[PDB]
A = this chain, B = another copy of it.
Amino acid sequence: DGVGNSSGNWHCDSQWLENGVVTRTTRTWVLPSYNNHLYKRIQGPSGGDNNNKFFGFSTPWGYFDYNRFHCHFSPRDWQRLINNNWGIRPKAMRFRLFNIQVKEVTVQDSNTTIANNLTSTVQVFADKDYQLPYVLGSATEGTFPPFPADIYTIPQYGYCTLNYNNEAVDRSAFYCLDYFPSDMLRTGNNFEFTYTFEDVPFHSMFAHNQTLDRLMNPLVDQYLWAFSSVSQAGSSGRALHYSRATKTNMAAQYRNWLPGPFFRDQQIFTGASNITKNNVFSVWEKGKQWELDNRTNLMQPGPAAATTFSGEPDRQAMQNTLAFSRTVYDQTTATTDRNQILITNEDEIRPTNSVGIDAWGAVPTNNQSIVTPGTRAAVNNQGALPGMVWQNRDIYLQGPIWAKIPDTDNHFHPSPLIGGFGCKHPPPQIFIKNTPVPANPSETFQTAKVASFINQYSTGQCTVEIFWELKKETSKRWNPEIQFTSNFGNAADIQFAVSDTGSYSEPRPIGTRYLTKPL
């Protein structure tokens, strides 16, 4: 419409429905002009380590990454969610962008002056066909702040392509984002589109009441005989013993089911008394990793596994657990104190999933005889076997919502190993740019490229609205259940709120799994 008429309103509320919830949220954003309106070739660092080398491009573009849970949910809405419900999955989504205003910057005499350029444009498009590198899956910075009053700096868009070390292989691709159709928007214009998620399984917000191996009736005995032991009958003779498993001996018993796939990881001593028992080492050396092409990569989340044994909370798996910063804005990339960061606990999957510290099992390695006594070896890694069941790593208020399942011939249980909902066709990437406005030309025709632009940036608001489908609980459990409660007792600042400086902070991580279900 016009410069004096607002494009849209502010919607941050979340309303609850029967079998669903819609969380709509709004932010104010700023878009820099990146690369001085240039597509540049970025590359990895030059050295002897081939693991960190890459080849790619950086674009004069930016993108909206809203993919985390605390963007959409408040800590109360999250609490209200996780206590009452067994499952959640996204259904539909509506993104819209409005109240665009571009500002012009002039710096003279070390004094900056900002005035708004009414005729300059911003251009936006969503990639619906997934024809661009999809960078939202990886969990990176540039997400909306959790707190609605904060302002969202839109990150720059760049991507990596097929490479040989730093230099580029023949099959590597260059994508120009200006070769897509886009919507140019002045201050009166706004942009909107809607999206509907493909069917994905509910994330299980429940734990289990039962252990995978305790599914039996403890009062009765099995009717199944099994081999038991070989004994020496006489001098050179032997005797084969068979025995039925009894309610007394559960360890040796017939079962229909096995724990899920397992890839072992090393242990650390996480607590004040145990901290001394740690050997001196690093993850890159003693940790678990997978390797692709000429590079080796740490297997960082890996398949989900219980992080620690029962009753031993202070000795836990080093690889599996996620960790978060208690503020989005912290600049420190390494820290030696754990009070500064939030460390997740994976113990709710312990009934079905085996702990990451101990081995998955043991296998007989040879054919026994009187000449050779039988041998056996531990199973550190185990692929899929028939009759396995396992739980996914749970989503967190601070964790990523979704990832894009790659386009490949074959998938196996495409659950993102960080967490969330794997999608063949995830929410589109939304790209936004400040169209370049050049500085005055030379008044005589010249062939040189145009390097001189008017320095400018844009700002405005963006609403994101998602419909979440919920799975209600039906439980005959008599006794009360664990639920997420806020207990700090007395404190100077309340938890999940601003400080006297005005800084919002999240004191502790929150997972979904509280309610329990029989196995």
Contacts and interface: CB of A to CB of B under 8 A. Distances in A.
Interface string A181-221: 11111111100000000000000000000000000000000
Interface residues of A, number: 123
A145 to B, nearest CB: 8
A250 B32 CA distance: 73
Contact of A5 (B1, B435, B450): B1
Interface stretch (A166-174, A281-289, A397-405, A418-426): A166-174
Interface string A454-497: 11010101000000000000000000000000111111111011
Copies of this chain present in the complex amount to 2
Contact of A491 (B9, B167, B187, B494): B167
B149 A447 contact: no
A254 interface: no
Interface string A297-315: 0000000000000000000
A377 interface: no
Contact of A448 (B40, B120, B174, B331): B331
Contacts of A449: 150, 329, 503
Nearest to A493: B41
A441 interface: yes
A83 interface: no
Contact of A38 (B9, B149, B438): B149
Given A443-B33, A450-B153, A487-B170, A188 B4 contact: yes
A114 interface: yes
A13 interface: yes
A69 interface: no
A178 B60 CA distance: 31
Contacts of A147: 176
A35 interface: yes
A116 interface: yes
Contact of A120 (B101, B111, B440, B490): B101
B120 A445 contact: no
A36 B37 CA distance: 30
Contacts of A137: none
Nearest to A169: B490
Given A101-B119, A186-B4, A153 B446 contact: yes
Contacts of A183: 9-10
A3 B118 contact: yes
Interface in A348-395: none
Contacts of A321: none
A114 B40 contact: no
Contacts of A490: 164, 167-170
A18 interface: no
A121, A461, A500 interface centre (most CB from chain B within 10 Å):
A121
A337 to B, nearest CB: 20
Given A4-B187, A447-B141, A181 B496 contact: no
Interface in A43-59: 43, 57
Q: What 4 A-B pairs have minimum CB-CB distances, sorted nearest first?
A: A38-B502, A174-B497, A4-B188, A148-B178
17 contacts: A3-B118, A6-B186, A10-B178, A28-B438, A32-B445, A34-B443, A37-B149, A39-B498, A40-B499, A57-B498, A119-B187, A151-B438, A156-B444, A168-B490, A170-B489, A330-B447, A440-B457
Interface of A: 1-6, 8-13, 26, 28, 30-43, 57, 60, 74, 99, 101, 103, 105-106, 108, 111-114, 116-121, 123, 141-142, 147-151, 153, 155-156, 164, 166-170, 172-174, 176, 178-189, 328-331, 435-450, 454-455, 457, 459, 461, 486-494, 496-504
